[PDB]
């Protein structure tokens, strides 16, 4: 009694996604961004496509490069992807990893000198996520050992064992800071959904390659925190910012984070094999996906950016909510069997192909305005790597493969 798109449609979508990943996204990253002056990868590519090898380089971006090429190598086997992941890994260990106090710096100069030495849990999480993926792709002992050490530092220096979750930012020597903001966009509050979502993401990937008992308890506690404090059943949206006791300190809505969390929360519970928790997580996951479907979409099926603190709808199409909606809508289809979610995934894919991707300049535009005009944003910067759209294509390819095997 399944309602399944026919084989032609599944295979056609899968082929377009694979072409987008390999002939646009990963081709752009492998050819435009490696830096032969300082090694590793440039920190910025302008809207004109010009790389900036002297620009400061962020840990999050470089972890995202590592994760994406590692995951693409694991799933597709292409030797160039292993080469690019190795390039990212070597620069990362040399320069971003703090050999003295542990963890990864926030920002380094192009030549690798530390520029911003704060230890932000969001950056520590992406390091764990990328290093665990690199271990998964290669079996590398050093990568896994490093991920484990950063996990230990997060728990040692940041875990709030009274109220749950984590202090989100420390200085280089792991002393907590007051200002945990990732950027000027973020509320000056002590707890954020965003950082906690990527702790969960990192811990789930680490657990898949290192199923330690205590880590299972920390991962389950994070899932439980999302269900009890962050997910809002009255609205189907994540609450974005909190005080230390998880009292809400924001009313903004991030559609991209909702639909990302929808599928990441289920990935995390399944990595645990926590069948007792799964019903409640699936319920919250499907709710987030439905709320996104009903409230976060333009008539073309693309995702709006946010509802701000004063209620303003930001109708800009940022690249990464579209990617996350591709995965989250396919995931909601797989979980519920409701083909309306597949139709939604197809619609966002068509938007990606017709508006978000930059066919002339390569990769994807960071932002497209509601009237269709691409903004002249950087193509690569501190916050724009290959991870959201690379992962979304990899996930879609594998999910469509599974669906194709129902026949
Ligand atoms: O507010 C911090 C920055 O967010 C960025 O988007 C992130 C997003 O917060 C989240 O972590 C997502 O899962 O990854 C995204 C892509 O970098 C950007 O909006 C940036 O401008 C913000 O400063
Ligand atoms: Cl990214």
Got the DSSP string for 85-108? HHHHHHHIIIIIB-TTT-SB-SEE
d(CA 227, CA 12): 36
The answer as to whether 390 is a domain residue is yes
**CATH number, residue 148:** 1.50.10.10
d(CA 58, CA 77): 27
The answer as to whether 314 is a domain residue is yes
Cα within 13 Å of Cα(31), Cβ side: 11
Question: Which ligand 1 atom lies nearest to the CA of residue 384?
Answer: 17
Q: Helices marked H in 210-247 — which ranges?
A: 213-225
Question: Which ligand 1 atom lies nearest to the CA of residue 382?
Answer: 17
- Give the ligand at the shortest distance from the Cα of 392: 2
Q: Phi first, then psi: what are they for 347, rounded to 5°?
A: -65, -45
Q: Helices marked H in 234-338 — which ranges?
A: 255-272, 278-295, 319-336
When divided into structural domains, the chain yields a total of 1
State in Å: Cα 4 to ligand 2 middle: 31
d(CA 341, CA 324): 13
d(CA 113, CA 105): 10
Supply 103's token pair: 């963890």
State in Å: Cα 119 to ligand 1 middle: 17
Its domain, for residue 32, covers 7-404
Instruction: List Cβ neighbours of 252 (8 Å cut-off, separation of 6 or more).
Output: 240, 306, 307, 308, 309
The answer as to whether 112 is a domain residue is yes
State in Å: Cα 165 to ligand 2 middle: 24
Q: Whose CA is nearest to atom 23 of ligand 1?
A: 183
**Residue 368: enclosing H or E segment and its boundaries?**
strand 367-368
**What does R_g of the chain's alpha carbons equal in angstroms?**
20
Supply 217's token pair: 């308890």
Supply 382's token pair: 């501190």
State in Å: Cα 62 to ligand 2 middle: 10
State in Å: Cα 383 to ligand 1 middle: 6
d(CA 264, CA 200): 8
Adjacent-strand bridge partners of 391:
none
State in Å: Cα 182 to ligand 1 middle: 8
d(CA 276, CA 279): 7
Ligand 1 pocket by C-beta < 6 Å: which residues?
182-183, 185-186, 194, 260, 320, 383, 388
The answer as to whether 197 is a domain residue is yes
C-beta of residue 197 within 8 angstroms of C-beta of residue 257: yes
The answer as to whether 200 is a domain residue is yes
Best mutation site among 58, 126, 181, 182 for ligand 1 pocket (most ligand atoms within 8 Å of CB): 182
Of 278, 356, 288, 344, nearest in space to 318 by CA: 356
The answer as to whether 1 is a domain residue is no
Q: Whose CA is nearest to atom 6 of ligand 1?
A: 383
- Give the ligand at the shortest distance from the Cα of 122: 1
Q: Whose CA is nearest to atom 19 of ligand 1?
A: 383
- What distances in angstroms separate CA 236 from CA 160, 233, 254, 293, one per listed residue? 26, 5, 11, 11
d(CA 269, CA 273): 6
Best mutation site among 320, 364, 375 for ligand 1 pocket (most ligand atoms within 8 Å of CB): 320
d(CA 171, CA 149): 17
The answer as to whether 270 is a domain residue is yes
Of 46, 41, 35, nearest in space to 361 by CA: 46
Question: Which ligand 1 atom lies nearest to the CA of residue 318?
Answer: 19
User: 3-class SS at 351?
Assistant: helix
- Give the ligand at the shortest distance from the Cα of 126: 1
State in Å: Cα 384 to ligand 2 middle: 5
The answer as to whether 2 is a domain residue is no
Give the resolution in Å.
1.7
State in Å: Cα 307 to ligand 2 middle: 21
């Amino acid at each position: 009694t399944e309602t399944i798109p026919d084989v032609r449609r599944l295979r056609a979508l899968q082929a377009e996604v694979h072409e987008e990943l390999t002939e646009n996204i990963l081709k752009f990253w492998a050819t435009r961004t490696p830096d032969p002056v300082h090694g590793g990868f440039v920190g910025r590519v302008g809207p004109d496509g010009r790389p900036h090898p002297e620009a400061p380089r962020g840990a999050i971006l470089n972890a995202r490069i590592l994760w994406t090429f590692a995951a693409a190598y694991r799933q597709l086997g292409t030797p160039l992807y292993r080469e690019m992941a190795e390039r990212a890994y070597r620069y990362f260990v040399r320069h971003f990893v703090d050999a003295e106090h542990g963890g990864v710096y926030w920002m380094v100069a192009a030549d690798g000198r530390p520029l911003d030495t704060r230890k932000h849990v969001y950056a520590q999480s992406f390091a764990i996520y990328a290093l665990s993926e690199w271990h998964r792709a290669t079996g590398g002992e050093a990568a896994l050992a490093l991920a484990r050490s950063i996990y230990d530092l997060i728990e040692t220096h940041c875990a709030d064992r009274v109220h749950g979750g984590y202090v989100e930012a420390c200085d280089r020597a792991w002393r907590p800071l007051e200002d945990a903001r990732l950027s000027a966009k973020d509320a000056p509050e002590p707890r954020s959904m965003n950082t906690h979502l990527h702790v969960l993401e990192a811990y789930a990937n680490l657990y898949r390659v290192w199923p330690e008992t205590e880590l299972a308890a920390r991962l389950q506690a994070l899932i439980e925190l999302f269900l009890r404090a962050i997910y809002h059943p009255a609205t189907g949206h994540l609450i974005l910012f909190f005080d230390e006791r998880w009292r809400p300190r924001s009313r903004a809505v991030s559609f991209g984070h909702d639909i990302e969390a929808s599928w990441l929360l289920l990935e995390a519970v399944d990595v645990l094999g926590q069948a007792t928790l799964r019903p409640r997580v699936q319920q919250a996951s499907l709710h987030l996906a439905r709320a996104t479907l009903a409230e976060g979409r333009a008539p073309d099926g693309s995702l709006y950016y946010e509802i701000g603190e004063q209620g303003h709808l930001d109708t800009d199409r940022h690249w990464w909510p579209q990617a996350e909606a591709l995965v989250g809508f396919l995931n909601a289809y797989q979980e519920s069997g409701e083909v309306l979610f597949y139709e939604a995934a197809e619609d966002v894919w068509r938007y990606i192909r017709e508006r978000q991707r930059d066919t002339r300049g390569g990769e994807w535009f960071a932002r497209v305005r509601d009237d269709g005009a691409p903004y002249p944003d950087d193509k690569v910067d501190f916050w724009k790597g290959p991870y959201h759209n690379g992962r979304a294509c990899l996930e879609a390819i594998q999910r469509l493969r599974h669906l194709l095997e129902h026949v």
